[PDB]
RNA sequence: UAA
């Protein structure tokens, strides 16, 4: 009913002066 | 705030398939140009008849074929963008394509890729209809097919299929395997020409059988190694599977590897082959010098035809194809597993019918006939027009003939505005019907067949006869025996009619009993060309051939509409009641009244006509046959309902259901009985050139034209393609753009034979003609540049037209080099003849003062590398094929005859990288300006030699034409010549002074009266100037690596102020200014098919006083952009004091696009409308226009609230139903419908500024 | 007087002619006439990246006073190469002809690192006294910054937007600086013992550091808190760099004779761990082709790697590229010239291989037959290919 | 106007006052030299101020010899140089 | 151990009364005009 | 009038 279509809604990144603000918990080597 | 529209549709054919997608009665030919999927029915004689066309929102990367159970039709596998697959099926009920499923692989590909993905993914289909793989590079996405419709997909790197797979060159499905198996060609260590000495045989080949386990939630694929070959030549790039193995195509070798995985033999195609380097198996040395230097070699493999008892006839043929359109026959005489007599033979083309075609894209066999001797082949080409060829005797007497061609404007490498028509104000003693109009002229092709393509803004008719003051309001031409007698004219203002016998120079016949003292509403032949019927304002008269009155019928009220068929007359009067009379068969002179249904009189009829069609046959008694069209009395009611009935109607009236709302689909149904009339005139008639199909054309009171197509099967239904944006917008419903219908009433006239074309003429201030080619949908074209009041048939295959100034002209359709498809009439101008064959033409300019065209040819001569001195570089080889250099010159072309008037040649290695016709200030004190031709010549040489170039200043001078032929009165005079250090990649004029670019340098020079040229300014560019444009004293210079920069130019104290730079770094292709009112924006095309909008915003906070250009939006195009130009913009309603401009760009795929800047409120309206259309309407292949246009590397840095609008999405608003249109419009704005229609008209007519000039 | 010139203008003319006409980039054949079909380095991706290898020694350069060269840096557009000397001078060298002489006398002590702004508008240079000067593209000294660090500056990297830059020194401290006023922002505290290298992520807000504590750390520029440590190197990590274009890969070299490339997208995943019998001295990512980088060793021996070709050995080794320890590498932004400086007080330029070359992979840079002025003819040759010699020698 | 050569010289851009303030620039390169502005006296010598429609020549362009460092893009003095920062061939130092 | 003024245009050299040119010892100073010009350009509008 |  909503018609098949490729989704497209990317999340905007904050992008302050130091760069893009990202989740820093993805950098632990584990 | 900009909107993107396609001026021209793509013409380069990139893919082709033969299948049964929309029907099983015949094998259709699917053609993909760039984003348009056209279904063709190939005839026996090779003609291509279009059945249905579809336009997609994204670049169609590849197409695949897959069948489905319990259906003869095959689902279409559509690949678009980067790693996207949409399964398409054809809905025969709705006559449209509906998406079955969507598969997205870009995210997984990015997650599994160490480096950035390739721009184009490659699709491969198993010849067992069980699986399909899509690989970008080293990453393969598998799409299993169940034998619900698709199993879950799995994405994996090539390394986990085979351990050694490290750099995939090609992947192909192998044939004659029980299980789906693939062949991988890869190079674990990358090797090129400069790497071969220290790396021998790097290419590896592995055969893996894929065991697919489709589970409910995921899919597991297990691969078993069938064979592995490790020593292969470095230049192998293409795998061509065959019945018993695979042919590996390289630049220098042709390797055959059987399904068991042994190198049986190779063929050394040229002197660069790995001679004695492999030395493992059979070697077939060849001195034919065949080079497959392309990345992927196009080929067709035809399986062996079955014999009478079921054999093979041993006729399995494989044909290769060079970039130069050389067809090669490769034979495989294998008696089994072993193969003998492996060789390649070049097919001889005696008549060189492939001379004008290069860079083939696809080959498809049209008709099989169960024989590999004869072959009909459709081949799409990147430069020439796509050809349908017939191959008769494939032997190791062979002959090839051309059956039909699909017009291709090839790569549009240049764009300019000039005077192709209206060079002379007076033609045949009368003003030019398309006077003071300009048209786009582009350069097309990449070689011998390169030509000039005139993108005509309007159809230019051929005038063979011109009259003055022969008409006032309307004309009619009678044909006693097809002899053009009795050109009756009428004068509505003074109620006068005249005869003007047209046998002899339109003399007054002065005889007969014709009512001269009354306004003639309609007069035509009647009763099988034995009677003449004339309907005046309040009377009906029946005459004979000699105008002797026989019957007179008096009408109480004045008549309005009247239509004639051979036995019947239909007359409508002011009250709205309908009167139909039937002529007496025996002795005429009666005109018996025809009984009408009593339901008809109680409802109001706006217009009516007598019609012949078979659409209502299935609802009539004793009629279930396709042919034998019935006579239908069609009428239009006040509620926009189309009704009709037969002569023996009893009391049943039928109706085209759904036409009041202008739905996508209409069907015939019984009619059972709000006065808001919009439909003004309808008529159902055949259109086309040789394949004439029935079409329902509707003329609305607002001036816009709607067309429906009757399907050859299930003829009681009419369909309109809403996805295809083929029908031009000519008006607006709710009295918007009333100036298009206010002056001259719009009347549609049908002509079954214009020049063999069944066309529809629409009168008005801006006339329109509807022309349908056999291979294209009907198109509405602007007809001339003067108003058309009345049009009547003339002689055989001609019409007579009368304008608003009482001038009569006889017109014929020009069909010699013209293609009446692709949204605009295209004129092919062949500059190269059989005598002097100039190669690819480029950098076309127009000299306004002399009214001439200048183009630069570019011949590809062999390149001889030389050092700083005149010494050949060490590693040369004379007895080997060499790489191609360049050799260019300037051609002076007179548009009057389209012949080269003056030609000058530049030395070896020279390429004219930029030529411009510019107004140069030759005196600063007096501000005198002269139009000079400036050509930027770059010496295209190797990297290791110092870069050099030259610039030439040319003045077009008027000389005495040499006796013998006219139009040779102009010659090129070289004002100034200078060789400079550094390649001259661009030429641009700024404030009467011209700026050229050296190597990493740009210089501004000024010319004085004494023809002295001296540099005055100086600026340093980062890497390499790709394009440069000037707006007054402001300049933009594009860089091959760092975007572009904004530069202001000052005089007296000459300065080059660095106003700003683009923060985004991209390899720009073309530049142009997008002013949009007080502000300033720039349009930059990227090498990644992206066009960027950037603005100069010194007042913005984080712009460093404007030094950082603000990135506004990025818009992904469907092909690379070769050229951009600034064009004045036409305003229909609001004409501000400041001028307006638009950007026009030519694409490599043969398409032309324009960017139209918009104001704030217009942008808001169109943006909300586009969002509503995208979110609520059904996209064709499931493609998201936002994903197609904005999913690029610059999405994050742009303004997410102000993207570039795609006019292709907006035009779907015009194609919606009336109620749907209102619902979409009201979502933002109380008067949003009216203003939205107004600015849609403004965008559509934005390029009509070419219609008025000087 | 004609001389060797390496200009990419004509290849760009050919490339844009091919692109604007829809023609493909034709495969180059092993013959000199096919050199015209060698496209500029920015045009090669995928399997064509092998063409971008700077395997050909094209020029040897040196200054009038032979000083140690601690750092070299190409101009942001690649027009010139800036050579810093141990005496605190700047040597400029035009890329087209490898010719320039005039010095600058930039710093009072040995210049240890230079870095250009992403917008090509500024350069920041440190020295041995902890002094961080700021330069305009015309080399105008606009900001002094005296006591930037107590010890010698080691590395400096600009933020993506260029308003901030991080500096590290022999002192075990990293300082974030606001470029607008030159003021010192928060201090990145940690890193026992000296910190040798630092880098800013090309787009993300992230700092990668290398120190003597055998650690590579990730920092939050906004907060200054260390967010991740790499406990893999067994000795001092000398250099660490992000991939300049996308930044998905972080590579660092250690005195433990091991080079490690980390995929920052997936939990610091170990991609490549190559080891050599000689110490790795400095590294350099390819500016155009990802997955390709060059390692410089203590015995010369330039080593070029490819993530997509070999994860254990270099795809090309130039065993005798320099006569002594190589101190600094610098790829041209255009990607067609590779510049290397070593302790032998010489700057050597490298270009892409030719379709045919008698002396290919036989130059005295590939075999140690460096007799007298073996580079005299290589530097004085007008052409590039040259005829076969004994090894590629000269007088 | 002319479709071949559209008139883009005198266009009402709204950043014209900014271009007059910074760079002392305008969209008319051949504007007359102001008779009030004096390079030595400074920007305060013009009654119309920096937004003067005429031309205010900076003192850098009053120099007699073209700067050799500016030609190479290596002039450390910028607008304060005593040599001409203009591509004037007749004023070149031989 | 003591440097010599090589590229400095002597406009940014001040007599210290470190680095010398001809007998007299000087020191390199900033380009105050350029840095303050940059700060002025960072402000909004002009 | 120079670095
Ligand atoms: Zn003034
Ligand atoms: Zn100067």
Residue numbers in the entry:
A (entry chain C): 532 to 561
B (entry chain A): 1 to 147, 193 to 441, 496 to 772, 777 to 1357
C (entry chain D): 28 to 422
D (entry chain B): 1 to 94
E (entry chain F): 207 to 223, 240 to 268
Relevant lines from the article:
Most eukaryotic messenger RNAs (mRNAs) are processed at their 3′ end by the cleavage and polyadenylation specificity factor (CPF/CPSF). CPF mediates the endonucleolytic cleavage of the pre-mRNA and addition of a polyadenosine (poly(A)) tail, which together define the 3′ end of the mature transcript. In the yeast Saccharomyces cerevisiae, CPF is assembled into a 14-subunit (∼850 kDa) complex, which is organized into three enzymatically distinct and interconnected modules: the polymerase, nuclease, and phosphatase modules (Casañal et al., 2017). The nuclease module contains the endonuclease Ysh1, the pseudo-nuclease Cft2, and the multidomain protein Mpe1 (orthologs of human CPSF73, CPSF100, and RBBP6, respectively).
We next determined the impact of an isolated yPIM peptide on complex formation. Substoichiometric amounts of Mpe1 comigrate with the polymerase module in a complex with a synthetic yPIM peptide on size exclusion chromatography (top gel). Including the precleaved CYC1 RNA stabilizes Mpe1 on the complex (middle and bottom gels). In agreement with this, we were able to obtain a cryo-EM map of this complex at a resolution of 2.6 Å that shows that both the Mpe1 PSR and yPIM can bind to the polymerase module simultaneously in the presence of RNA.
